[PDB]
Structure 1
Amino acid sequence: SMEQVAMELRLTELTRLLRSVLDQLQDKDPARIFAQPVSLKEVPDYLDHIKHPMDFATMRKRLEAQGYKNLHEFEEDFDLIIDNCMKYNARDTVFYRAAVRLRDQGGVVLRQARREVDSIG
């Protein structure tokens, strides 16, 4: 139907905006701490601690299958990256501190993305 096509054009445009948002978020992680999944070879107990792992590569695979229906879903996954790290790692670590910085800096980007998703519809 033409209605289905139009919904698909909206999904595609959301996907384009989310890709730019994701690049901007990942620049706030110049150390690449959050680039890839936590390795189960190197942290074999990780899944006893963290139930829903997340990382930027995993987000990127989802995005390119147009798997985010809205910004809420995308923010949930970004929040998991930060929140998993701040539970698994202690306050006095390079990992926890990188999370806090990504959160603070990413909040700016997300504040305007929420306005752009609303605005462009």
Structure 2
Amino acid sequence: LTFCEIILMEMESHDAAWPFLEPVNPRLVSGYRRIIKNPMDFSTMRERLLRGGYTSSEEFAADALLVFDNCQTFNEDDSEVGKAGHIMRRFFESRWEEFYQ
């Protein structure tokens, strides 16, 4: 899972990562809690990873993909947040394939 941490750090430093660094505060984003039932973000992933809460790379990847699937459900593809989610998903998938094929 050290390679999960490497990928997480690269995601956290990406130019398109800004929507995903911290949990969405649903008080500030109308409809978020109604539409997205299983929120996820990179800081929540980091807290779990550091504490040993992922028992396989698959569990970590499922949380990453949940970030991107939530983003695609909630936001238009041509919105700033939606565009960022598509970039981040492809970045994740590309880096993932280097360590986990």
- Common fold: TM-score over 0.5: yes
**TM-score normalised to the size of structure 2?**
0.90
Contact 2:68 2:89 in 1 (8 A): yes
CA deviation vs aligned residue, 1:8-28 (integer Å, no higher than 9, x gap): xxxxxx2x2221121122233
* SS in structure 2 at match of 1:69: coil
Looking at CA atoms only, which structure, 1 or 2, has the larger radius of gyration? 1
Structure 1: runs of 5+ lacking an equivalent? 1-13, 116-121
Shift of 1:31: 5.0
Q: Provide the TM-score with structure 1 as the length reference.
A: 0.76
Over 4 Å off, 4+ runs: none
Is the 8 Å Cα contact of residues 54 and 81 (structure 1) preserved in structure 2? yes
Residue 49 of structure 1 corresponds to 35
Aligned counterpart in structure 1 of residue 7 of structure 2, from 13, 17, 21: 21
Q: 1:73 maps to what in 2?
A: 59
For residues 60-119 of structure 1, the C-alpha deviation after alignment (integer angstroms, 9 at most, x for no partner) is: 11011101101100010000110100110012201110011111122111001214xxxx
Matches within 5 A, 1:27-46: 27-46=13-32
- Alignment-derived partner of residue 85 in structure 1: 71
* Mean Cα deviation higher: 100-109 or 22-31: 22-31
Deviates more, 1:45-54 or 1:25-34: 25-34
Stretches of structure 2 lacking an aligned partner (at least 5 in a row): none
Retained in 1: the 8 A contact 2:16–2:84? no
One-letter amino acid of the structure 1 residue matched with residue 39 of structure 2? P
CA distance 1:49–1:68, shift in 2 (3 Å) = same
Report the number of matched residues.
Answer: 101
2:22, 2:41 within 8 Å by CA — same for their partners in 1? Answer: yes
Match in the other structure for 1:3: none
Q: Give the Cα–Cα distance (whole angstroms) in 1 for the partners of residues 72 and 47 of structure 2.
A: 24
Percent identity over paired residues: 33
Distance 1:30 1:97, change over 3 A: closer
